[PDB]
Amino acid sequence: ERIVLVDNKCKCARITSRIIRSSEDPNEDIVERNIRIIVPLNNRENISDPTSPLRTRFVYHLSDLCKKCDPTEVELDNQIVTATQSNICDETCYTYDRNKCYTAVVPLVYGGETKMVETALTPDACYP
């Protein structure tokens, strides 16, 4: 019955909130705030850079995670108008995305050919 507030997939943070009915009285029901954050201990600071240093500090601004500037459509009396959902936005992130695929260009040398081939940083998402 819990709804998903954000389901951010490159900063692993699944914010859900449920109004769990703790009693028959509908006033003392507590509004839960489940924030499930999966912290990659082996991912680097720039995830598209293999040679980047390992990430030691993970900072999760939940005001930035809960941001919404996909403009929704509301229906007025004589018009359909795009509606901005937040005043915050008008970005670095720590985990790979399962839907996306990230690539890196590495120099491969056989003598002096120096062919700049590409490398699939994750293998499963590019070629399932």
């Binding site: 507590i30 839960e32 082996n42 009396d77 790979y96």
Partner: protein, 232 residues
Amino acid sequence: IRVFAIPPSFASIFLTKSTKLTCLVTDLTTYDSVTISWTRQNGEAVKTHTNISESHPNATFSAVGEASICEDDWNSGERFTCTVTHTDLPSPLKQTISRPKGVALHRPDVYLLPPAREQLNLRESATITCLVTGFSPADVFVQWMQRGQPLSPEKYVTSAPMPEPQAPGRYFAHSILTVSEEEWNTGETYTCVVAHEALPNRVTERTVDKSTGKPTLYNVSLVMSDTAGTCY
């Protein structure tokens, strides 16, 4: 005995998409048909729908004369005047009307306040407040919507835009939507649509329900896994 000279606001030129201009002559003196003729700078009579008002409680004759000139005349900044021609009590009134010229533009920082926990304990009449503040031309239109469908206009009262106390140039305007407490306690989503000139897409929608409100117990879990490079 009173008169009005209402200009088209940003409400009446956005939800209806037609700049309606009327000078509400309100029960001055018993006349057969109070003619109302809007005029431009040269002074020709704009084609005005002159409607005779219904029987007032004070029963003196009133009229509503509206002429829907389009957006170019109001956007150009040209003053108007309805030449209300008086044969009975012959005192002509030049009720002038013009757009605000050269006013500033500041974005409305709209916030949505859920009903107070003190108020919900009385089990009726939850009041949700759409605090629209920080708008400079002082013309704001606020509509409350349920699930994308607009609410009744009697369900909410939007205050007139009063000046901001701290900031001199900006203004603010409340919107008290009174709903049943059993409606708000089911987590029903309430959306405040606010329209103003300074907004980029010209309409802002903020949503509130019991899930969006301040959580009384967080459930933070920080899974520290060294193998999940991707996300679950």
